[PDB]
C-alpha cells in the first residue's frame, strides 16, 4: 500500500528533502517492511504550487464529499494525489513555534481525503521542532486522521546542507518510526 511523505517546506534552499530522504530510505531498508512492499511517494509542495489567494471553491472542503464536487481544478488534482495515499508521513520544519504556511494551505484545501488515514509527524528544528509537531498533530486530529505519533528530529539550524557527520545520526529515530509504521500496517 502507498505511503505519502509530504514535505512541509517550500523554501528555495532547505533541509526538508534531506529529512524526507532519510524517512524514505529508513522505511525502504526496514526488515519488517521489505515484505509488505509499500510504495513510497515523496510529495513536494513547492512543485504542486497550490495557490494561496486563488480558490474557485466557495464551499467549505468539509462540505465537499468527493473530488468532482470541487469547483477548483488545482484542488481536484491535489485531491487525487492525497486520496491515493494510505499512510501519510508529514515531514515538516518549525517556523516560529508553528507549522509552515505552505503545509497548512495544502492541508486546508482538502478534507474527506484525510479522514481516518494514519498520519506520522516527523518534525525537525534546533530542538526537534517539537512545538510545530504538537500543533500539527492537533490539526490532524481536527481532520479526524489516525495520528500514529510524532518524532522530533534535532538539526543544526543554519547549515544547509546537513553536515556529513549528522546525517548518520538521524537514524537514532529509526526504531520509533518503524515500530509506529509497522504496527499500523
Ligand X SMILES: Cc1cc2nc3c(=O)[nH]c(=O)nc-3n(C[C@H](O)[C@H](O)[C@H](O)COP(=O)(O)O)c2cc1C
Which stretches of the chain bind ligand X, using CB under 6 A? 9, 11, 14-16, 60-61, 93-97, 108, 125-127, 129, 142, 157
> Which of 132, 105, 117 is closest to 184 using CA atoms?
117
User: Based on CB atoms, which residue is closest to ligand X, 27 or 132?
Assistant: 132
Q: Is 51 in the site for a copy of itself (CB under 8 A)?
A: yes
The answer to whether the annotation marks 124 as part of a ligand binding site is yes
Q: In the bound complex, what is the minimum distance in angstroms from residue 135's beta carbon to Ca ion? A: 7
Q: Which of 134, 149, 154, 182 binds Ca ion (CB under 5 A)?
A: 134
∠ CA(112), CA(114), CA(119), 5° rounding?
165
Q: Which window, 21-29, 51-59, 73-81, 166-174, contacts a copy of itself (CB under 8 A)?
A: 51-59
Q: Contact at 8 Å (CB) between 3 and 85?
A: yes
The answer to whether the annotation marks 78 as part of a ligand binding site is no
Q: CA–CA separation, 120 vs 141, rounded Å?
A: 12
Q: Is 149 in the site for Ca ion (CB under 5 A)?
A: no
| DSSP E strands, 36-131 | 39-43, 87-93, 118-125
Scan for cell 468539509, then name that residue.
Answer: 62
Q: Which does 127 bind (CB under 5 to 8 A by kind): a copy of itself, Ca ion, ligand X, none?
A: ligand X
Binding mask 124-163 for a copy of itself (x = CB under 8 A): -------x---x--xx-xxx-------------xx-----
Q: CA–CA separation, 101 vs 50, rounded Å?
A: 11
- Please state, in angstroms and as integers, the Cα–Cα distance from residue 170 to each residue in 23, 85, 93, 132, following that order: 9, 25, 15, 19
Q: Which of 82, 102, 121, 122 binds a copy of itself (CB under 8 A)?
A: 102
User: Which residues in this chain contact Ca ion in the complex, by CB under 5 A?
Assistant: 134
Amino acid at each position: 500500500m502507498k505511503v505519502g511523505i509530504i514535505m512541509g517546506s517550500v523554501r528555495a534552499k532547505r533541509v526538508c528533502p534531506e529529512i524526507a530522504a532519510y524517512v524514505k530510505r529508513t522505511i525502504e531498508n526496514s526488515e519488517e517492511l521489505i515484505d509488505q512492499k509499500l510504495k513510497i511517494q515523496v510529495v513536494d509542495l513547492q512543485q504542486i504550487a497550490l495557490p494561496l489567494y486563488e480558490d474557485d471553491d466557495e464551499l467549505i472542503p468539509a462540505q465537499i464529499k468527493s473530488v468532482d464536487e470541487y469547483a477548483d481544478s488545482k484542488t481536484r488534482s491535489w485531491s487525487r494525489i492525497v486520496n491515493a495515499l494510505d499512510i501519510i508521513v508529514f515531514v515538516t520544519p518549525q517556523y516560529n513555534w508553528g507549522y509552515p504556511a505552505a503545509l497548512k494551505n495544502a492541508i486546508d484545501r482538502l478534507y474527506h481525503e484525510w479522514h481516518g488515514k494514519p498520519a506520522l509527524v516527523v518534525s525537525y528544528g534546533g530542538h526537534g521542532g517539537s512545538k510545530c509537531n504538537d500543533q500539527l498533530q492537533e490539526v490532524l486530529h481536527g481532520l479526524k486522521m489516525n495520528v500514529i505519533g510524532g518524532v522530533a528530529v534535532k538539526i543544526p539550524v543554519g547549515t544547509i546542507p546537513l553536515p556529513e557527520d549528522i546525517v548518520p545520526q538521524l537514524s537514532v529515530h529509526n526504531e520509533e518510526i518503524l515500530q509506529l509504521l509497522a504496527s499500523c500496517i
